[PDB]
A paper describes a structure:
The pro-globulin consists of an acidic and a basic subunit bridged by a disulphide bond. 11S globulins predominantly exist as hexamers due to the non-covalent interactions between the trimers. In this study, we report the crystal structure of 11S homo-hexameric globulin complexed with Indole-3-acetic acid (IAA), an auxin, isolated from seeds of Wrightia tinctoria at 1.7 Å resolution.
It belongs to P212121 space group and has six monomers in an asymmetric unit forming two trimers. An asymmetric unit consists of six monomers arranged in hexameric assembly. These six monomers of WTG can be divided into two trimers (chains ABC and DEF); that are stacked together through hydrophobic and hydrogen-bonding interactions. The hydrophobic pocket formed at the interface of the tetramer (adjacent dimer from each trimer) on the IE surface sandwiched between two trimers act as the site for binding of the ligand. The indole ring snuggles into the cavity formed by proline residues of the acidic subunit of two monomers from opposite trimers, whereas the carboxyl group interacts with residues contributed by the basic subunit of two other monomers. The indole ring goes deep in the pocket and makes pi-sigma interaction with Pro121 of two chains lying diagonally opposite to each other. In one orientation, the amine group of the indole ring bonds with the backbone oxygen atom of Gly119 of chain E. The carboxyl side chain oxygen atom of auxin interacts with side chain NH2 and NE atoms of Arg427 of chain C and water molecules in the nearby vicinity. The results obtained from MALDI-MS and HRMS confirm the molecule associated with WTG is, indeed, indole −3 acetic acid. Results demonstrate a novel function of WTG in the storage of plant hormones that are essential for seed germination apart from its nutritional importance in seeds.
Residue numbers in the entry:
A (entry chain B): 27 to 34, 40 to 130, 141 to 207, 219 to 274, 285 to 462
B (entry chain A): 27 to 34, 40 to 130, 141 to 207, 219 to 274, 285 to 461
C (entry chain C): 27 to 34, 40 to 130, 143 to 207, 219 to 274, 285 to 461
D (entry chain F): 27 to 34, 40 to 130, 143 to 207, 219 to 274, 285 to 462
E (entry chain D): 27 to 34, 40 to 130, 143 to 207, 219 to 273, 285 to 461
């Protein structure tokens, strides 16, 4: 129901330690593989999320599926096509030729995805993906299990329209049905339905399309179908020109919330891309209204996290390919190593905001100097230095 | 609190089986009876609902009560009068005559209910019902326990203003109170209060009104009181003319959501009525954003449900009087038997939507042909058959 | 996550007993103390709240902190200053002389007895007692609030402080002073002072010569809107009454039609003042739990629940907290000194349903329903409707 | 544009007189007629409305059309079929047999006396009368609505029709038949039929053989939500009453707490039924103009405005329209045959303020204010507050 | 005030004719020029809009200004940098070296051909051309918008500038320099530079060796409301929302795409038609349409309230045309195709089709049209079904 809770330490988010995490299981398909982070880790259970890394080979088709939880998809590498189906919307990508005959077809709009895209999809919505590039298409999918859109319980379901094998709730939805019953409903013979059920077809859930996928797509140009049915699903965060915060020699923050992408308001999710130059820092801070789930796409650095105890919750490296969860209100500091550091972060609220302890937007600045003089037993000059020594907002220059 | 959960990889809604459910327990009153579905069934626990079927006889008055959860009430049979009390609104049903005398009275608006009506009531609202007719008035009540309006825990409370019993949380709220204390508050003798407590009453919670209930109701015509206090509480779904989908020879769907009945937006519920002619079907589909709770009011059919396992969750018949629950995102197929099939369904969201696997609105059409060719290993002809063979939306013609 | 439940059919709110509660644990600081109600009590876990009574001595400073749950704060006694920081807003209380009165900071709030202050989760707040009498704050944290995505336990995360299972901590302590120093651009020895290790004054510190801040003197863009949100309203003046019955008393309600921030927080409050022997009509809360604190006097409280047996029937008095869950019927009568209560309710626009008086459910139902249900005569059923002509506050005559 | 104003204090609503009005022009069609109230009357200009009475005879089809202003349609008499088209919604009334009963189209609505129907600007609608008695539609268009970005004049754009300054036109006529034919994929002589070349039936045509529609038979995605929006509600049954005073009569209110589309449209309505000699309490509309149509009976209406002299004190009777602007005080009493009124108000959640009865402003103000303002005794002031125990509808024998 | 009306049965939008329009006036600057469409034209007064085309030369800086009306800006050609200031937001583009490379300013936006930028009334904005080719901005100001509480005329208030009936002014000129200097803490000689009264470069100035900005390069509320996206690019055929092979595309821009459009009550689209392709005949059900032809040409027919066509003729590159709410229209591309950018005066503006799968013809029962138009049943089926496209028609 709407009223759920995780499987399970005075409480499920009273974590004494957090660690960067790697995937715990790999599923092979014909045309790629899926790596799953352990859904039972305390970090993931506290954050209410699942995390998956799909790796789709060249000419690989990821079988359409729907989930019980909304998600953000980060395109980590590659480029391709994503489909998303809005039920009751007309098919507006149309070709009435020929009369390669598979070019005669009508379907819903398809989306051209590329590295740096963050794609937002509701629960219940069918989606699929196809890699048209030579390099692998790598999708990092964060499913928000605790979202109001999931009325089941705090476990991910993946319901596929097709597929078969080459504790997970992952299934071809046509399999548990009577093919004759489904056949009569669809107006097709039950042997067509047996092909939907994928009997004797063990390619997994990403299949190779040998000669390339044929679809209706716009060529070079050298009612509600216009509004609701056209909702923007993604935005690219990769261009440094898309930065919202920029400190020269320090790096960028590129935020993605419902002031940018409208569907995020319904989904109650946000994201960001942070790029740090070598040795640069993000100001120490906490998330005031959200958990943060970060994936390191490039580089490395040091992360320190503080919680409820006098002892540190984590103090160590993060590096490429790792995920890390920072719960709401835990304090954290990041510094890039010598190669820089690039992260994408999903946050469990729309309009997720952080509170800084350093810089022009700091809580230290906002409090009277004499409060800090008394609390910290500082002199006036020591407390001024605390307020004003860093003049940056959010992104710290390693050279100050 | 707001943060609750039921009694129940594995999860409370990870169901490998569902079955049609009949009531598990009957409570007999003087002027009718109440049948309760087992609240501990896995289906009900997952969907976060209770279900009750109240049968109110001729000249039967169902004692006023309030609950901790909002509800939809389906009028399965009969007709009668329903009261619902909005606190802080004035009494706008008014008679100043005479000077028999109980006709001199003021009370809030009463509602004239009939078969096919679906009535929506928030948590905490006092309501009551009466049957004027000779046929029984049958109300199917679906309480949404996981609703935000319920801050207590995932169990139904029934708090009656009167009544007496001769674990269910069903109680006459006056009984625990000190009658002297309540009488001093109310300005009445503590013996009137002991009549409110009804400690020696054997009639239960539906009482006979031998000579018929008298109230202030409009006669033949042959400020905030106009707006908030007037909120509409019901809509009738029975007329085929109220259909939103109609397929000749197949049947109708009549949907009830917040574009139809404004109070549903606040309650986060919606409802529909499906009528299938013999052997007709509703397209195979799943609910995107809600659980479904269906009650068979006439006829019979076959239902198949799929879930997360390669094996079916249910494949069998459904029959008049049975309740069945389909959780969010489970796929289901329905076909009417040889007498047709009528269902009313409550869904656990505002503007609940289904996604079809067949027909013009199908997800199959929406996806490029070549994806299906590749995924299912179909020919181009077979893929096109799959897209276009059924030209219906939602309700399938058996011919 | 967003989907949680307390450590608590036998639901967490199926309470066969309630009773008025006093705090169970006290924490001593240099400049006052903190009294905590037992967070494990069935009543508190049902209501989804934590309750704290902070007592701040003269010249005492309550170290800044933030929590995982929104709160209402009732100023039971005294007066003082309250800070609340909105991240990303500029410092608009400014002094540029001399060139610690040279400072810029956020707007500070002047608080006094009768104020109800509303703060979201995650916001840094602090408080200072200006007056000679103790400043007494009753804080109700709403743990089950949507703003709390962690679990159903309060975190108090302090910016400073140290000792003079609770999740109460100086957030600087678990960070590396050299790492935090580099980010802050200060020496690590300054960071060690933030960590307060060697400083054991607790979380309320004495300010010998009085706190110096930027405050407005006598006058004898987004900074103007979002950043200037109202955070409190005073409920004490009988003139702020919304319901008044002469010889009876007042109810002074605080909801989002009064204080806008309450809409986002999903909380409201009220102050009830009853003259000796007066009553609030019997009723139930139709969309909220109520958490009441008795600030003055005493009275009788009866609560009814799901059983034939009363859930409570007895005295309430000064200093006690009582919880009435959603839908439970209750009646209150003031004793011979009167009765003052402040109450917090777990909803935006919390509403009660009356069983007595001009807004009663009894009036709204047809007379012949009550005739038949209760086996009353017509005169008796009219008595029941009409004998009390008051709304909400009953006149002891 | 959005920023408009009428052709014509003394501002446009500083009205020294209001009168009940009758229609000023009749347009004859083949299969009925349309009666139009004078759009230049000061009352209609003030209220920002256009009022039309359409009379559709048996087997009369009112040609589909759309307007630049939203409307409330009151079914004064008869019953029939109404269609409204939501663009981009699928056709969910479907018949696949035989292999003009084989058709798909959008939902059609079965309309009857007492129905109030709400339609936005720009939506195509049409109606058909299958019954013996004439189908009588009173259409109130809200010209000043935000939905109308043109100017303060109604347009009536028909998809068909031709004559049997009003802006009333068959929209196909100003198009080039070759160009339109190419676009539609039909021969340009089919297009000439669309232009209703040589067809002079007006805008209600007779259906010689009766209309063949796909309509639900007896039962003895977005298409389910947005595309299903409720367009109407019946107000006629005394059981639907929101306010009832025995021997006095009823008020049945229609606003966005009842019919959700009204929120978007910023309109509301009500039906008032008064037994002989009964009254509606004197009052004013605090946030809307009122546009009332008398469907049955007769009565006395008095209106007060900004001057010492009454704005109107006189009879109203069946078939008359009367406009009461925002904040003008009014009182109504039924005649010896009772009085039935349907009223449109220019706001979502239109409310009135009562000078008499339990909801009155008199009750809300301290007694001593009225003692001092009116120079009454304490007893006279209590009489004023309390002599009428009714809310809104007054008992002629209280 | 909020209650206004344009300068001058009969009504301001009862148009018997519409025409494609070109600018009526050209204002030269040092580093570009501005072309203004006649604001008294019946079409523009009906639609409640002004239209301007600014052409900015290489290394030209368009002086910052603010207006009383919200606008959509179409980047017709070129690329550059646009600034927009949100008052009360912090400067988050920051350089602290050397110790004018050392500066802090608000975010700057990299604009390019195909971008549609949305700006509220009252917001200071400015633009600079990075490239060799001219930067060409087509600006549609929505005068009738609720954001304009003044009256139905555009004001252009510049922070600088001076000449090289329009309400176009350097806001510092009417101020006393001593008084403004005292407030600003600067000498009155700086304020006289602000006033620019002996500067004859106009409102677009040449920046000799490039503008020095803090901008990214080799790779609280400040993160939310201060970040609001102001633009979306419509040029890529892949951004298309409606696509008919051999016909063209429609790429729509409304508040389900770009959140700020909800507050502004505006939307836009780009239409690209292959040679001889059509958009289905239709009307705008809830807005006026203001179309600018960026490429190519075509035939446009418009119908209104009479039996006489309102317009039937060609539209060509560089021309603006207005279709009021509810007027019916048909468009066909000429032999080079047609590209249009359109601004519509509503949030979530929608059109109704007379042809194709979404048509009103399909939604109405067959027998209604059989009776209205005196068609055979086969004719009326042809009328519903002969075009199976939605919105964009295949010329074959
Ligand atoms: O109306 C039609 O003929 C096509 C159409 C419009 N909206 C639709 C949604 C789903 C499937 C088809 C359609
Ligand atoms: O812009 C500035 O220079 C100051 C400023 C404006 N808004 C702010 C928000 C937080 C901190 C500083 C500022």
């Amino acid at each position: 129901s709407r009223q759920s809770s995780p499987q399970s330490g005075i409480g499920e988010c009273d974590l004494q330690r957090v660690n960067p995490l790697e995937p715990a299981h790999r599923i092979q398909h014909e045309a790629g593989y899926s790596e799953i982070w352990d859904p039972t880790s305390r970090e993931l259970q506290c954050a209410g999320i699942d995390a998956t890394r799909h790796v789709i080979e060249n000419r690989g088709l990821f079988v359409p599926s729907y989930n019980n939880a909304p998600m953000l998809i980060i395109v980590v590498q590659g480029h391709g096509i994503l489909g998303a189906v809005f039920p009751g919307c007309p098919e507006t990508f149309q070709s009435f030729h020929p009369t390669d005959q598979t070019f005669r077809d009508q379907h819903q709009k398809v989306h051209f995805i590329r590295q740096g895209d963050v794609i937002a999809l509701p629960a219940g919505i069918v989606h699929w993906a196809y890699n048209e590039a030579t390099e692998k298409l790598v999708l990092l999918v964060i499913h928000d299990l605790s979202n109001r859109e999931n009325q089941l319980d705090q476990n991910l379901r993946r319901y596929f329209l097709g597929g078969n094998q080459k504790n997970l709730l992952w299934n071809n939805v046509f399999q548990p049905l009577d093919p004759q019953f489904l056949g009569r409903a669809s107006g097709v013979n039950s042997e067509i339905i047996k092909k939907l059920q994928s009997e004797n077809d063990f390619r997994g859930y990403m299949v190779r399309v040998r000669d390339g996928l044929r679809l209706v797509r716009p060529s070079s140009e050298e009612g509600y179908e216009e509004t609701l049915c056209t909702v923007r699903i993604k935005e690219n965060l990769l261009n440094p020109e898309r930065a919202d915060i920029y400190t020269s020699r320090g790096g960028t923050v590129s935020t993605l919330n419902s002031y940018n992408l409208p569907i995020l308001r319904k989904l109650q999710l946000s994201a960001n891309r942070e790029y740090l130059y070598p040795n640069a820092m993000i100001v120490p801070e906490w998330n005031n209204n959200a958990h943060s789930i970060s994936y390191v796409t490039r580089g490395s650095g040091r992360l320190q996290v503080g919680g409820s105890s006098k002892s540190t919750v984590y103090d160590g490296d993060v590096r490429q390919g790792q995920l890390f969860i920072i719960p709401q209100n835990y304090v954290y500091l990041k510094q890039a190593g010598p190669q820089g550091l690039e992260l994408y972060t999903v946050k469990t609220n729309d309009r997720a905001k952080a509170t800084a302890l350093v810089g022009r937007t700091s809580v230290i600045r906002a409090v009277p100097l004499d409060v800090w003089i008394n609390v910290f037993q500082l002199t006036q000059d020591e407390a001024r230095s605390l307020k004003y020594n860093r003049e940056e907002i959010t992104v710290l220059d390693p050279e100050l």
